[PDB]
């Protein structure tokens, strides 16, 4: 079990860790989050009581070091930092627990939600999508733009997702125009799976990180990336059996975990009606299809 201490909480903010979150009042003695399950990535995120705009947060992994939160009053926000002095860090943590000013990561033992949402997410890959390599954790917020969005401005703050575009030379072999555009198996399997992602686990990991950023920060370009990555599988007539079964699990927990009230901007009506009902893989998402219909029959 690991801990993320907070120096203080000077401003009224809603703090989220993974799918959980807490209201914290201006200068409430709040001093961290304990009992964080080792073995997965995590994200801590913030929304100030005064600015319900710009949700932000830090993807991290406690195996990679000791991290803590400190409010910066110049830049106006909660900053994740690393403490390099191992001894000095366990000293802050043990004293805050003793004083019992920390919340416990509130995991039900029956619950594999976080694992299913993050199965294939690896911190090494996150830090290639969010390049800032003087930190072991990664910053994301509501406003950050993707490399594909930028192409149609500041690259230091960009989400360097893999560019997917169905009407590109990359996607379409000369001479197989009609073939490759109606059946994307070429683009998925040779260009993306074998060529760029190397394996399906890196693909699923990006897909899931994209979803998660859409969900926790309303990052619009992230939602576009997740949709595009589902769409390419469902529009491929030839997909490994193991990917299809897994995709149906992955989406199922993403749909399960979405707030009910956000289904209008985070869910692309066209993509889902194509994937579930028109695509090659209509019949291969039995759990994703059942959950969508019994929960959002309107969008379909």
């Amino acid at each position: 079990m690991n801990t993320v201490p907070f120096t203080s909480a000077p401003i009224e903010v809603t703090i989220g860790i993974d799918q959980y979150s807490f209201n914290v009042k201006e200068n409430q003695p709040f001093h961290g989050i304990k009992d964080i399950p080792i073995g997965h990535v995590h994200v801590i995120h913030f929304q100030h009581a005064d600015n319900s705009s710009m949700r932000y947060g830090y993807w991290f992994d406690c195996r990679m070091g000791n991290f803590y939160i400190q409010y910066d009053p110049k830049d106006g926000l909660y900053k994740m930092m690393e403490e390099r002095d191992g001894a000095k860090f366990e000293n802050i943590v043990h004293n805050f627990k003793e004083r019992q000013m920390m919340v416990s990561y509130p995991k039900i033992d029956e619950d594999d939600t976080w694992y299913n949402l993050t199965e294939f997410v690896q911190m090494d890959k996150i830090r290639k999508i969010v390049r800032k390599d003087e930190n072991q954790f990664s910053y994301v917020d509501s406003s950050m733009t993707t490399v594909q969005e930028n192409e149609l401005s500041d690259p230091a703050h960009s989400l360097n997702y893999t560019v997917i575009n169905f009407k590109s030379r990359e996607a379409i072999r000369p001479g197989h125009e009609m073939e490759d555009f109606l059946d994307k198996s070429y683009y998925l399997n040779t260009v993306m799976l074998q060529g760029i992602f190397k394996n399906s686990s890196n693909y699923f990991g990006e897909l899931q990180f994209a979803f998660l950023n859409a969900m926790f920060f309303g990052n619009y370009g992230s939602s576009l990336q997740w949709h595009a990555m589902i769409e390419l599988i469902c529009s491929s007539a030839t997909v490994p059996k193991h990917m299809l079964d897994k995709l149906d699990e992955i989406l199922y927990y993403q749909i399960k975990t979405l707030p009910e009230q956000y289904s209008d901007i985070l869910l692309n009506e066209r993509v889902w009606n194509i994937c579930l009902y028109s695509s090659f893989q209509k019949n291969s998402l039995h759990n994703t299809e059942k959950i969508m219909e019994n929960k959002y029959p309107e969008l379909l």
């Binding site: 009407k167 590109s168 030379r169 379409i172 000369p174 125009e177 009609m178 555009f181």
Partner: protein, 237 residues
Amino acid sequence: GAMNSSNYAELFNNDIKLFVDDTNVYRVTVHKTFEGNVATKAINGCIFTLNPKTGHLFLKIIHTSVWAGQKRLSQLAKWKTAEEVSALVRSLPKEEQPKQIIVTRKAMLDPLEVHMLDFPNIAIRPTELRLPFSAAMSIDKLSDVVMKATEPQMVLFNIYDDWLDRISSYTAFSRLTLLLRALKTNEESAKMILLSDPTITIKSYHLWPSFTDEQWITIESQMRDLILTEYGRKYNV
């Protein structure tokens, strides 16, 4: 974006552009089989590709052989249209390649876009106008060369004959579209109007009769009256 009545005079500037109409690429007759089921029989067809400024028409004939052993033909037709337009563009010297291509049916945008990916600076555009290019097979000489063809074949024409010697491309294009609108709405009468006078003939190197200027006015008016009549008959107005 889309072409419509607002930006209509852009067709006649000096930026090269081409209309593409795929309505007659895949053409069938429908008929009953001995067992009483329905079957289609394909007949020859054509891509109507037309530069509205100059009258140059690139009539690509689509031989029935293309369809042989192919499924989802009406879908393939859109890809074969787009393949043949791509090929035409590639065949043209650089300074003759169009800067825009206006498809008359939106279903062609994706097939054409995909086929033109080697030409990112040629803009593929839809139109909101309801152009009558489908009636091109009512022009006897195009219908004849299409039906007779025994292989894929491109045939070149000037759809305006020699009109531009005496009127503008704007006026040329309005005459053409009025003629074809009339031929679409009631072919028999439209054709009658054009030929009732044995003495006005069609040059071997033309499509339309050699009307004098005055006679074109009378013709244009006869086609206008044809089109309006047919409307009240359609709707009971």
